[PDB]
Design a protein around this motif. Structure first.
Motif, PDB file in Angstrom:
ATOM      1  N   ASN A  41       0.809  -1.295   0.040  1.00 50.98           N
ATOM      2  CA  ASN A  41       0.114   0.158   0.067  1.00 50.98           C
ATOM      3  C   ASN A  41       0.867   1.250  -0.024  1.00 50.98           C
ATOM      4  N   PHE A  43       1.077   3.609  -3.101  1.00 44.06           N
ATOM      5  CA  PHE A  43       0.580   5.064  -2.963  1.00 44.06           C
ATOM      6  C   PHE A  43       1.653   6.086  -3.708  1.00 44.06           C
ATOM      7  N   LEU A  88       1.056   8.382  -6.573  1.00 44.93           N
ATOM      8  CA  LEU A  88       0.826   9.637  -6.401  1.00 44.93           C
ATOM      9  C   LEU A  88       1.960  10.560  -7.360  1.00 44.93           C
ATOM     10  N   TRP A 120      -1.781  18.230  -7.032  1.00 41.77           N
ATOM     11  CA  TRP A 120      -1.947  17.368  -5.648  1.00 41.77           C
ATOM     12  C   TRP A 120      -3.211  16.819  -5.207  1.00 41.77           C
ATOM     13  N   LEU A 175      -4.185  12.831  -5.324  1.00 43.35           N
ATOM     14  CA  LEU A 175      -5.040  12.286  -4.338  1.00 43.35           C
ATOM     15  C   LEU A 175      -6.148  11.407  -4.514  1.00 43.35           C
ATOM     16  N   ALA A 201      -5.087   8.314  -6.174  1.00 46.05           N
ATOM     17  CA  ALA A 201      -3.990   7.274  -5.426  1.00 46.05           C
ATOM     18  C   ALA A 201      -4.658   7.180  -3.982  1.00 46.05           C
ATOM     19  N   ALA A 202      -5.558   7.907  -3.518  1.00 50.33           N
ATOM     20  CA  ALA A 202      -6.033   7.770  -2.041  1.00 50.33           C
ATOM     21  C   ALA A 202      -7.205   6.639  -2.149  1.00 50.33           C
ATOM     22  N   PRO A 203      -8.264   6.812  -2.974  1.00 54.23           N
ATOM     23  CA  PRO A 203      -9.211   5.547  -2.925  1.00 54.23           C
ATOM     24  C   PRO A 203      -8.937   4.277  -2.851  1.00 54.23           C
ATOM     25  N   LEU A 215      -6.664   3.125  -1.181  1.00 52.99           N
ATOM     26  CA  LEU A 215      -6.294   2.780   0.448  1.00 52.99           C
ATOM     27  C   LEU A 215      -7.457   2.476   1.208  1.00 52.99           C
ATOM     28  N   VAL A 216      -8.842   2.814   0.790  1.00 51.83           N
ATOM     29  CA  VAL A 216     -10.020   2.671   1.529  1.00 51.83           C
ATOM     30  C   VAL A 216     -11.271   2.286   0.868  1.00 51.83           C
ATOM     31  N   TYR A 274      -4.565  -1.444  -4.024  1.00 46.53           N
ATOM     32  CA  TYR A 274      -3.051  -1.923  -4.406  1.00 46.53           C
ATOM     33  C   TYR A 274      -2.799  -3.232  -4.307  1.00 46.53           C
TER      34      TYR A 274
END
Ligand SMILES: *[C@@H]1O[C@H](CO)[C@@H](O[C@@H]2O[C@H](CO)[C@@H](O[C@@H]3O[C@H](CO[C@@H]4O[C@H](CO)[C@@H](O)[C@H](O)[C@@H]4O)[C@@H](O)[C@H](O[C@H]4O[C@H](CO)[C@@H](O)[C@H](O)[C@@H]4O)[C@@H]3O)[C@H](O)[C@H]2NC(C)=O)[C@H](O)[C@H]1NC(C)=O
Ligand SMILES: *C/C=C(C)/C=C/C=C(C)/C=C/C1=C(C)CCCC1(C)C
Ligand SMILES: CCCCCCCCO[C@@H]1O[C@H](CO)[C@@H](O)[C@H](O)[C@H]1O
Ligand SMILES: CCCCCCCCO[C@@H]1O[C@H](CO)[C@@H](O)[C@H](O)[C@H]1O
Ligand SMILES: *C(=O)CCCCCCCCCCCCCCC
Ligand SMILES: *C(=O)CCCCCCCCCCCCCCC
Length: 326
Positions: free
Chosen positions: A111, A115, A119, A161, A165, A168-170, A172-173, A178
């Motif tokens: 992850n 990320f 990113l 940025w 995000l 690259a962020a979704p 993770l949640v 990943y």
């Protein structure tokens, strides 16, 4: 049935002989020979040895030369920072994992690496979008009594940025995820496995539309216009050899930038598209490495194109490398 599935991974090799292992737990020498893992490590070594100095110089020379600190250039600093996220989050990690033959840092490290690398490439991607917007505005002047300054440049940087995000962020949640790709030593977005628990299908459509199609249209429009304006102005000033040469220079460079953007991202977009519309097909590990090869190598060729080929930066860099002279 093409590979072997696991809670947080998809190994692109059949387990009918019983030799497949978690890419978090053991070497993947049945996917590819140890020497091919070494060559992966060599390739990351090359990208570090070239990508670190080139992008670090970009920042360092900018700290030593007042002429470079203009607002139009802020987005190019941002590009070099992004390239360094790829170098230090991506390439160093993969050098290390490749020489073990698997993703030794486990699913949390997967992850993390995924990320920071995602990113990085996304900040770079949007940096090239914003630079095209910024140049279109400055040259084509589509809003009257507007002067591009510091404020706008800060906003351009912040926008990249935020868009990065948003990619690259979704994962993770809950939206995509990943997992290890290709030879299983680097981690990226799961764009190729239908995995309903994380809604991979919708995330790939969002990625393809918002992070590839929108970028591509904005770039072709902005630079399409910019070339039109410059060529129109030069046809109205054929007495100036200068203006005619500047028009040739601008046109050649725009062709190079646009081709470079396609080389960087079309392989990921094409492979994702092909896989999306050919769901009954096996894709091996070397094949799945090719999109990454094109994208990751841009941490070297983008700063060569956008920075090294600009004569301002080139003078300052020589000066800086020659301790203050020339
Ligand atoms: C790819 O395909 C292979 C083959 O199917 C999978 O590997 C097998 O995974 C299973 C577990 O899911 C392994 O079974 C366990 O073996 C353990 C180790 O001890 C064995 O000792 C004997 C000698 O007595 C050897 O001959 C064997 O080779 C083993 O080394 C053992 O601890 C364990 O038993 C425990 O759990 C089972 C329930 O599953 C109970 O029966 C038992 O009571 C106890 O609780 C298992 O039997 C198997 O050994 C693996 N085989 C090989 C060849 O590696 C991979 O996991 C598949 N890959 C992926 C990624 O999914
Ligand atoms: C080292 C690996 C890196 C930096 C990979 C990054 C990958 C992307 C940002 C790819 C994004 C895309 C998809 C997942 C499919 C649709 C097309 C893209 C390029 C937006
Ligand atoms: C520049 C950084 C160098 C990276 C050092 C990599 C250490 C590799 O570690 C090796 O991995 C093998 C798995 O194939 C294990 O069998 C061995 O324990 C180990 O020697
Ligand atoms: C999205 C960016 C597209 C850029 C369009 C390129 C336009 C190609 O136009 C060409 O440019 C050359 C260089 O001056 C000329 O020598 C050719 O005669 C001219 O037709
Ligand atoms: C300021 O002007 C500093 C310039 C550097 C002067 C020293 C020149 C040394 C050149 C030799 C390079 C070889 C390095 C390879 C090591 C493996
Ligand atoms: C200005 O006067 C200074 C110029 C001196 C630069 C010397 C050229 C060095 C090239 C080195 C490339 C080596 C690659 C391997 C690195 C470990």
């Amino acid at each position: 049935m093409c590979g072997t599935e696991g809670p947080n991974f998809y190994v692109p090799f059949s387990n009918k002989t019983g030799v497949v292992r978690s890419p978090f737990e053991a070497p993947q020498y049945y996917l590819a020979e140890p020497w091919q893992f070494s060559m992966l490590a060599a390739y990351m070594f090359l990208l570090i040895m070239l990508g670190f100095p080139i992008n670090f110089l970009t920042l360092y020379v900018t700290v030593q030369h007042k002429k470079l600190r203009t607002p139009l250039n802020y987005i190019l600093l941002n590009l070099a920072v992004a390239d360094l996220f790829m170098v230090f989050g991506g390439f160093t990690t993969i050098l290390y994992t490749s020489l073990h033959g698997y993703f030794v840092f486990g699913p949390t490290g997967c992850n993390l690496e995924g990320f920071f690398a995602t990113l990085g490439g996304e900040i770079a991607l949007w940096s090239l979008v914003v630079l095209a917007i910024e140049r279109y505005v400055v040259v084509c002047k589509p809003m009257s009594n507007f002067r591009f300054g510091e404020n706008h440049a800060i906003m351009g940087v912040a926008f990249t940025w935020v868009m990065a995000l948003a990619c690259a962020a979704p994962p993770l949640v809950g939206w995509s995820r990943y997992i290890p790709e290709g030879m299983q030593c680097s981690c990226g977005i799961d764009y190729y496995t239908p995995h309903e628990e994380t809604n991979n299908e919708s995330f790939v459509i969002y990625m393809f539309v918002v992070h590839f199609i929108i970028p591509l249209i904005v770039i072709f429009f902005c630079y399409g216009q910019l070339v039109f304006t410059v060529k129109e102005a030069a046809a109205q000033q054929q007495e100036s050899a200068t203006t005619q040469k500047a028009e040739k220079e601008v046109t050649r460079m725009v062709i190079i930038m646009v081709i470079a953007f396609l080389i960087c991202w079309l392989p990921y977009a094409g492979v994702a598209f092909y896989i999306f519309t050919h769901q009954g097909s096996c894709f091996g590990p070397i094949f799945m490495t090719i999109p990454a090869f094109f994208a990751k190598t841009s941490a070297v060729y983008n700063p060569v194109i956008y920075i090294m080929m600009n004569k301002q930066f080139r003078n300052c860099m020589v000066t800086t490398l020659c301790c203050g002279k020339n």
